[PDB]
Paper text:
Four clinical MDR HIV-1 protease variants, MDR 769, MDR 807, MDR 1385, and MDR 3761, were isolated by Palmer et al., among which MDR 769 exhibited resistance to all the tested inhibitors and was successfully crystallized.
The CA/p2 P1’F-MDR 769 and p2/NC-MDR 769 co-crystals diffracted to 2.10 Å and 2.30 Å, respectively. By superposing the MDR-substrate complex structures on corresponding WT protease-substrate complexes, the substrate backbones were overlapped in both the MDR and WT complexes, and only minor conformational differences were noticeable in the long flexible side chains. The results suggested that the static structures of binding conformation are insufficient to explain the difference in substrate recognition of HIV-1 protease variants. The p2/NC complexes with MDR 807, MDR 1385, and MDR 3761 were calculated to have higher desolvation energy than MDR 769 and NL4-3 complexes.
Numbering used by the authors:
A (entry chain A), B (entry chain B): 1 to 99
C (entry chain D): 1 to 7
Amino acid sequence: PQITLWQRPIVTIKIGGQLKEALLNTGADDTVLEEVNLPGRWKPKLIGGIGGFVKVRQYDQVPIEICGHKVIGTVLVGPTPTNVIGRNLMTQIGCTLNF
Amino acid sequence: PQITLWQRPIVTIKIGGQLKEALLNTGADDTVLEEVNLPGRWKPKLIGGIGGFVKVRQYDQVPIEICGHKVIGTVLVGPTPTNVIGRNLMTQIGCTLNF
Amino acid sequence: TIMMQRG
């Protein structure tokens, strides 16, 4: 598709056998979700946003389905205002910005 | 340009007669710069994100060049970590997600 | 919302 941005570019993602939705976000380095069904251990990771820094849960090599593709990437679980797919996963689906 | 996402998508902006650079941010509804010098009246706004809420000045109907292209729009001004171009401006320059 | 994220 060619997604315009007259609205949030939200796509559907399948992670841990739950359908979630998240915003294709070119201004985030990483993928960050609020709650996900991921059973295993994770590592402590600090991220930066606009108001300060949050500590998040880093799960590596997670199998995830975004808009029709099965992808493997790092997925972070943190206090994000909305679910967000970052460049780590957008690159893997070949997503570019055009203008 | 077709811009890949292996690195931050940063572009030249031209605001208040200053060449600056800013991050095309599809996960931002609004546009936010570090402190710059603008004519016009401002009204205060609180904007949210990772790390919580920040108080900014909202300037209306501001002229600005993004990668050479002049567009007019609401520009927020505040103690952002980095210059951010939001969906409000990106829609004016014809910017789309592609995959 | 301004979902700028650095990691």
